[PDB]
Amino acid sequence: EIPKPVAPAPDILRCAYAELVVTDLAKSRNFYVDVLGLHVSYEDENQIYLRSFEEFIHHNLVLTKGPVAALKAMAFRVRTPEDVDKAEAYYQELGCRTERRKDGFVKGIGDALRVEDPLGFPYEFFFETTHVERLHMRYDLYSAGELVRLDHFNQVTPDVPRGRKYLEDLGFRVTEDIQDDEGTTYAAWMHRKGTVCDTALTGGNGPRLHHVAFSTHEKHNIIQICDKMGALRISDRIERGPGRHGVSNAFYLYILDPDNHRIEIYTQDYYTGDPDNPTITWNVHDNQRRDWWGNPVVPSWYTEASKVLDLDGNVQEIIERTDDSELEVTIGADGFSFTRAGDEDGSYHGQASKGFK
Amino acid sequence: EIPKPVAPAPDILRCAYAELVVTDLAKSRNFYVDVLGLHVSYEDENQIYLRSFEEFIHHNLVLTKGPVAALKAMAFRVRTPEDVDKAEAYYQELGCRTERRKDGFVKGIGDALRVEDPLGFPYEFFFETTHVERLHMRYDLYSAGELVRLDHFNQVTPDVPRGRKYLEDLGFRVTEDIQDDEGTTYAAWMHRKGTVCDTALTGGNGPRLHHVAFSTHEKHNIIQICDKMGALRISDRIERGPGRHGVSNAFYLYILDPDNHRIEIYTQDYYTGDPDNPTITWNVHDNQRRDWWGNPVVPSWYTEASKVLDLDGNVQEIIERTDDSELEVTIGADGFSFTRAGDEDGSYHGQASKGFK
Amino acid sequence: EIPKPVAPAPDILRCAYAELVVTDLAKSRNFYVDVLGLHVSYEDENQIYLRSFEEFIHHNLVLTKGPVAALKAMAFRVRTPEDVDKAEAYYQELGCRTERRKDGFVKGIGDALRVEDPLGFPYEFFFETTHVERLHMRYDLYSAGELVRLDHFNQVTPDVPRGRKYLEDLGFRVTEDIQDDEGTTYAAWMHRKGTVCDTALTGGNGPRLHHVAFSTHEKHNIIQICDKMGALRISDRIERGPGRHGVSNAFYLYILDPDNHRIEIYTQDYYTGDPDNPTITWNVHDNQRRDWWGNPVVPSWYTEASKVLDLDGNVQEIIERTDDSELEVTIGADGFSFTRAGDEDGSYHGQASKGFKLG
Amino acid sequence: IPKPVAPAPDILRCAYAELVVTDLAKSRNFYVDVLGLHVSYEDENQIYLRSFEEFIHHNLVLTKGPVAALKAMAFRVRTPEDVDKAEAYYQELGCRTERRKDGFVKGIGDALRVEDPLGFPYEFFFETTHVERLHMRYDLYSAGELVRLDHFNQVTPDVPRGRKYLEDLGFRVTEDIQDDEGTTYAAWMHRKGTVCDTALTGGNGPRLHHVAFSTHEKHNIIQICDKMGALRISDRIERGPGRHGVSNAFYLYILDPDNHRIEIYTQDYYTGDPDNPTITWNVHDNQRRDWWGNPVVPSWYTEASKVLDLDGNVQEIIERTDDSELEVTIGADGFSFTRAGDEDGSYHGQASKGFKLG
Ligand SMILES: O=C(O)Cc1ccc(O)c(O)c1
Ligand SMILES: O=C(O)Cc1ccc(O)c(O)c1
Ligand SMILES: [Ca+2]
Ligand SMILES: [Cl-]
Ligand SMILES: [Cl-]
Ligand SMILES: [Fe+2]
Ligand SMILES: [Fe+2]
Ligand SMILES: [Fe+2]
Ligand SMILES: [Fe+2]
């Protein structure tokens, strides 16, 4: 297990941006700008910097051209400039590789620390960022599918309890999780900013980035994204949804960018800011835990996720999960799920719900 | 081929109500009233008469207790009392069995003609009906899932072209249809009231009733029905959806009542009332034709449908479709669908879209 | 009273388009295209042809440059080419001036009849029109405020019963109206296509055009139009709303184009297509009849409306209403309105609701 | 008001209000039958109500009494120890305090009430009885469902004096309304990372302007209006619905049976970063309150609820001497603009959209 440092944890505000390596910058621009409507904060021949409708920091997404599509950094904003120093001491005590750039790794971020964290993920911590025009009332720019905030990340990692404890020490609080009666944990959601999560852990082979999630105002905004993808005849890039989540209670959609990076669109989870916020544990065999309406979870959702890079820009080696697989125990040949616990009517054995194998 | 009568067709206004035979009147009441929120016009120990939020005629749905769950009548309102005379002469010329009752078959309907039509379906034609309180501004009653109108019926019949010609002679105009490149028709939608349909034909073994559809005002009302069914832990009665249709462009959901009668919830199709309204023909292998977002159509949607009765109340014998099956050609072991015509990428061979078999 | 002709009425399908004369074509284009998002079917230096998201006929709105802003024609589509002949015979029997153009008055319309109707309004009847790409599934184009259909017209005329009878003979059925207990009709709504209206009559000096109405899919689309107008710092062009109507039960908004032509945005009225559809009569003093939430009706809504042209292109002379004024009897100095019939509590005497008086 | 040496309590959020109501049954009809709030406890004396997503015992306590008024506006603090900190903080300010180890109302434990420097009855507590969180109970969900308590708004005569005091208590200003000659008319300030938890409106005070509840979506607010029309109580819709300038939220103001003002609110923005950009509006900007330029009804500026001291007696009102927002915008000498510097779309001596004061 990952020891708790004696050094104080940095005070993390929220998830702030991701840097994604993409192979074809123009095709990625098409997707994030022309399809999804994100707002350009800066661009050149090598990178595109993008933000959501309500953001005032420089960006929520950096697309960087490179040879291998991968997550390069998932960045958290910290409360004060001194929290970057705290982050550096903390990860140094953990024995992690760190790199400090006083003028930042990407445009519009100042003093920043990147680390290869104990789960193999490239985290950035920063305070300083260039403020830009907050577009929250620019209804002359507002899209029918407008993405309004960056909401969270979701990470694939083999040992969820191990990661959970490490994130708890860093000040994240678990809001919801998925377990079975045998005591296996399959997934956990944890927050700093007072929503259901800022990052989440999904059990599986890792380190891999499962998705980045953006918010909309209303459910019809998410519908419109689907409708637009149909009109553009790219409905094959709709992976899963739209649906209502069990965990989080949010309305959701998962789509795939040109490099198969998964993006979640999300709205209307609940407030978690009180320190005794009640934690919700779902049973892995509950067929309403993921999609509340009982729609089946496509296998690619469980098996596919993005590579992540180390600080040299090389792909991180993957460690295979040895705990039980959520896919296998729910929709695989020996799996099952229920609608009502203890009722064989509305239960599914060795296949998924709604009549699919 | 069904001949065109010399006798003038009745002027049909719209689909008006269905009479469904149900086996447990209390369990059906719980579904239609407590779950779905339909409004009771009249009830006793044998029947429940239900209407939608904006209706002023007596009812849109009659639940009749009986031994075998089935459609007993699908009723269309005609423009004048004299149109019921026209209907009787028309169907008599077609050689169809008819029955006229000057004081109605069900409460709140006056002079009414029931027929066993050329496709084996029990049609009713009526003008006279008891007006009731139109609840369209009763927002003190309005449900988060409120059903606002009856929109259409959908019939399973083995020979779609044969049925289409008959309905056209009767004054219905085809709005959309599904065909392939080998001369087969799989489905057609046709209207009187200036929406995408009043009734529709689905290719399959029949006569059977595929579904009855009710409208909501907005898409979030359909999402609420799903959310409520999750909370009631009856998500296993959500068959398909929610989604955006290709055909009709409506937002939709299909659910199953306690006798497996299929109900569609529907909103926001388009105006068809101009006589040169452009017809839209989809290819049966186009994976956006049914669900615009490419979500797979569950096999039960193709295979399951309700019995229909003759005028003596006996189940109509089912005649097998010999034309190609939409299920088989799209999602069966030798099926095919595409996202983009001519593009191998995003096509599906011998399985359904989005990872499922 | 206007006689019922012996000649059969044309079979009218629906309101189809309006031709509005505008003074500055580029400013008008900015409003209808850049602000409101209507789709351009054709344009040149003299005219802009616009359609809604779900339309397949050539256009729903023609903007024509000219010296005096006005309604030039309100056009109804008829069921068959033969109905254009029927319309011509019908209006000739009424003694009205008519003009027939075999190849249309505006682009994308074929054989068309324009008439100076008995209320002084320029009506067009046509069947033939150039079909265009129906954009109803073009969600790549869909705006957060998208206008999806043309819904109706609303006309200001001094004598509502006179107009009502004439339109009923033409086959429109009244769906709702506003009357008082002393025999006065203040407004009526009437349809062909099975919505609350295709045209409507509002009591006042006329002929003038009160508004043209377009639909949206959902209420949030109307909210977005307001939000966008705020962002563009043209909220002064929001005249009234948004609200819920009593009459029609639709969610609504009224805005003003650059020549002060009034546009209604509208959604979620109810089905009226049955021939015995119940007619709803509201009392003029009911403060929920126009805005269901009781918000006050701005005086300009009652006083301001667009000029209309005759067939020569000259403005029609205005005839003064002599019947009682809706403005005066509800929000004027001797006006009255109620929230609950017979309850003094929530009534308004000599002023508007919600703490306001006439400016 | 000086900054104490004693540390401020760590305040999480607004948590509940206790309103005194004169007829408990009529108030129940409004809050439960009209608005759909959920009952956590009730008897002949009190009704305890919560929103759809709440897990603490209540967001609103309706207490029967002779004079309708705010009795307490309560904030939840982060730890039990923060209640001790609140007590020492307000004692150093010289304010009257009362501590009850077992609470003032049911479902709250150790609690401190104070008559604060602006005359308002604040409560601070940590301990509360958890209840069933109804957030997925879509079998109960109303077309107008109130999902959270969002904020309070207080009327006080000197906004800068109040603002400085709340800043010392850890609230951060998000937005405000000023004029060019240095008068402040209103300020909004937060702890939980929304546009506010409490807010100050310039006017005679102390009075409680409103309590605000959230919905999920804008159509839920529309439904509340529609329902009030159907119930033929549209006269209790005071103002709206609208889009706010300040906050950018969709809104509605309605009046309960004792004229307590309730706001329904949705879709403001995230303010939790410590350098969150502040926004200051000019008082003459006709889009600052209603973004669409709809007129602000005069009662919104003039009417607000009494507040009580710790003995249950009404607090004396102190008159505002700074300029009045009503007078400078919609009064006979008032003005507002749509575009700064433009006479077109400006209003002089009356409100927008063709109305003057009734
Ligand atoms: O539907 C699921 O898989 C559960 C779930 C809940 C919240 C999320 O953000 C997420 O990505 C996944
Ligand atoms: O419209 C207004 O008056 C400005 C405003 C903004 C946010 C609030 O919560 C509020 O109560 C008032
Ligand atoms: Ca009278
Ligand atoms: Cl379908
Ligand atoms: Cl009106
Ligand atoms: Fe997620
Ligand atoms: Fe259907
Ligand atoms: Fe209108
Ligand atoms: Fe407020």
What is the residue-wise DSSP string for D278-310? Answer: -EEEETTBTTSSBTT-PPPPHHHHH--B-BB-T
Take residue D88 and report the two structure tokens written for it.
């020492």
Hey, whose CA ends up nearest to atom 4 of ligand 1?
A290
Neighbours of D342 (CB within 10 A): 11
Q: Enumerate residues 6+ apart whose C-beta is below 8 A from A82.
A: none
> Residue D301 C-alpha to ligand 9 middle, in angstroms?
13
**CB contacts, 8 Å: C217 with chain B:** 268
**CB contacts, 8 Å: A248 with chain B:** none
Q: State the method.
A: X-ray
Ligand (nearest to CA of D292): 2
Q: Enumerate residues 6+ apart whose C-beta is below 8 A from A344.
A: none
Question: Which of B36, B135, B137, B140 is most worth mutating to test chain D (most D CB atoms within 10 A of its CB)?
Answer: B140
Contact status, residue D144 vs residue D191, Cβ threshold 8 Å: no
For chain A, helix (H) and strand (E) counts, in that order, are 6, 20
**CB contacts, 8 Å: A289 with chain B:** none
**Strand D172-178 relative to strand D97-100, pairing:** unpaired
**CB contacts, 8 Å: A300 with chain B:** 355
The C-alpha atoms of residue C166 and residue C189 are separated, in whole angstroms, by: 13
CA A110 to mean position of chain CA atoms: 24
Q: Is D140 exposed, middle or buried (0-12, 13-18, 19+ CB in 10 A)?
A: middle
Q: Enumerate residues 6+ apart whose C-beta is below 8 A from C299.
A: C327, C331, C358, C359, D354
How far is B96 from chain A, CA to nearest CA, in Å? 39
Query: Does the beta-carbon distance from C219 to B219 stay under 8 Å?
Result: no
Query: In degrees rounded to 5, what are phi and psi of residue D81?
Result: -65, -25
The C-alpha atoms of residue C78 and residue C69 are separated, in whole angstroms, by: 27
Residue D139: closest C-alpha in chain B? B228
What's the longest Cα–Cα distance across chain A? Answer: 61
Contact status, residue A278 vs residue A338, Cβ threshold 8 Å: no
Chain C partners (3+ C-beta pairs within 8 A): A, B, D
**CA distances to B37, B350, C282 from B141, in Å:** 9, 48, 21
**CA distances to A235, C117, C214 from C17, in Å:** 35, 17, 11
DSSP letter string, B238-290: EEEEEEE-STT--EEEEEE-TT--EEEEEE------STT---EEEETTBTTSS
Neighbours of A55 (CB within 10 A): 27
Question: Which of D127, D132, D136, D276 is most worth mutating to test chain A (most A CB atoms within 10 A of its CB)?
Answer: D136
Take residue C11 and report the two structure tokens written for it.
């079979």
* D151 known member of a binding site: yes
The helix-helix angle for C219-231 and D218-230 (nearest 10°) equals 120
In the block, residue with structure tokens 């400078």: D328
**Strand B61-65 relative to strand B12-22, pairing:** parallel
* A176 known member of a binding site: no
Neighbours of C92 (CB within 10 A): 14
Q: Is C280 exposed, middle or buried (0-12, 13-18, 19+ CB in 10 A)?
A: buried
How are strands ordered across the β-sheet holding D97-100?
Answer: D38-42, D46-50, D60-64, D11-21, D69-77, D121-125, D111-115, D97-100
In degrees, to the nearest 5, what angle opens at C-alpha C7 toward C-alphas C5 and C8? 105
Query: What residue type is assigned to position C77 of the chain?
Result: R
The C-alpha atoms of residue D237 and residue C354 are separated, in whole angstroms, by: 9
Closest CA to A104 of A135, A141, A58, A68: A58
Take residue C300 and report the two structure tokens written for it.
């300009």
Q: Is the CB of D247 under 6 A from ligand 2?
A: yes
Q: Enumerate residues 6+ apart whose C-beta is below 8 A from D318.
A: D119, D157, D204, D205, D206
How far is C254 from chain D, CA to nearest CA, in Å? 12
Runs of H (alpha helix) within C170-297:
219-231
* β-strand partners of C154: C211
C110–chain B Cβ distance below 8 A for any pair: no
Query: Does the beta-carbon distance from C277 to B193 stay under 8 Å?
Result: no
Residue C16: closest C-alpha in chain B? B274
Residue D224: closest C-alpha in chain C? C293
Hey, whose CA ends up nearest to atom 1 of ligand 1?
A290
Query: What residue type is assigned to position D343 of the chain?
Result: E
Contact status, residue D170 vs residue D274, Cβ threshold 8 Å: no
Query: Does the beta-carbon distance from A134 to D277 stay under 8 Å?
Result: yes
Contact status, residue C100 vs residue B244, Cβ threshold 8 Å: no
The C-alpha atoms of residue B9 and residue C318 are separated, in whole angstroms, by: 47
DSSP letter string, C164-188: HHHHHHTT-EEEEEEE-TTS-EEEE
Closest CA to A225 of A213, A238, A244, A240: A238
Helix-strand-coil split of chain B, %, nearest 5: 15, 35, 50
Take residue D25 and report the two structure tokens written for it.
């049954």
B232–chain D Cβ distance below 8 A for any pair: yes
Query: In degrees rounded to 5, what are phi and psi of residue C300?
Result: -60, -25
Q: What is the 3-state secondary structure (H, E, C) of B39-53?
A: EEEEECCCEEEEECC
Neighbours of B67 (CB within 10 A): 8
Cis amide leading into B8 (omega within 30): no
In the block, residue with structure tokens 């006979």: D332
How far is B175 from chain A, CA to nearest CA, in Å? 20
Query: What residue type is assigned to position D104 of the chain?
Result: F
Q: Is the CB of D71 under 6 A from ligand 2?
A: no
Contact status, residue D65 vs residue A282, Cβ threshold 8 Å: no
**Strand C173-179 relative to strand C149-157, pairing:** unpaired
The C-alpha atoms of residue A306 and residue A290 are separated, in whole angstroms, by: 21
- From the CA atom positions of chain B, what is the Rg in Å? 20
Neighbours of C46 (CB within 10 A): 10
Q: Is the CB of D47 under 6 A from ligand 2?
A: no
Atom of ligand 2 nearest to the CA of D153: 11
Contact status, residue C201 vs residue C152, Cβ threshold 8 Å: no
Query: Does the beta-carbon distance from B273 to C219 stay under 8 Å?
Result: no
The C-alpha atoms of residue D121 and residue D198 are separated, in whole angstroms, by: 13
The C-alpha atoms of residue A180 and residue A285 are separated, in whole angstroms, by: 8
Atom of ligand 2 nearest to the CA of D210: 11
Contact status, residue D274 vs residue D176, Cβ threshold 8 Å: no
Closest CA to A169 of A4, A319, A337: A4
Helix-strand-coil split of chain D, %, nearest 5: 20, 35, 45
In the block, residue with structure tokens 């650059």: C258
Q: Is the CB of D263 under 6 A from ligand 2?
A: yes
3-state secondary structure of B83: helix
Closest CA to C259 of C309, C305, C301: C305
Pocket test for ligand 1, best of A211, A290, A297, A337 (most atoms within 8 A of CB): A290
How far is B209 from chain A, CA to nearest CA, in Å? 21
**Strand B122-126 relative to strand B112-116, pairing:** antiparallel
Neighbours of C2 (CB within 10 A): 17
Q: Which domains does chain A have, with CATH numbers?
A: 10-148 (3.10.180.10), 149-287 (3.10.180.10), 288-357 (4.10.1270.10)
On the CB side of D203, how many CA atoms lie within 13 Å of its CA?
24
Chain D partners (3+ C-beta pairs within 8 A): A, B, C
The C-alpha atoms of residue A149 and residue A217 are separated, in whole angstroms, by: 9
Closest CA to C289 of C165, C225, C202, C357: C202
Q: Which residues are found with C-beta within 5 Å of the ion, ligand 8? A: C 154, 213, 264
The C-alpha atoms of residue C7 and residue C205 are separated, in whole angstroms, by: 30
**CA distances to A13, B134, B162 from B2, in Å:** 73, 39, 7
Cis amide leading into D160 (omega within 30): no
On the CB side of B225, how many CA atoms lie within 13 Å of its CA?
34
Contact status, residue A238 vs residue A4, Cβ threshold 8 Å: no
PDB resolution in Å: 1.5
How far is A330 from chain B, CA to nearest CA, in Å? 15
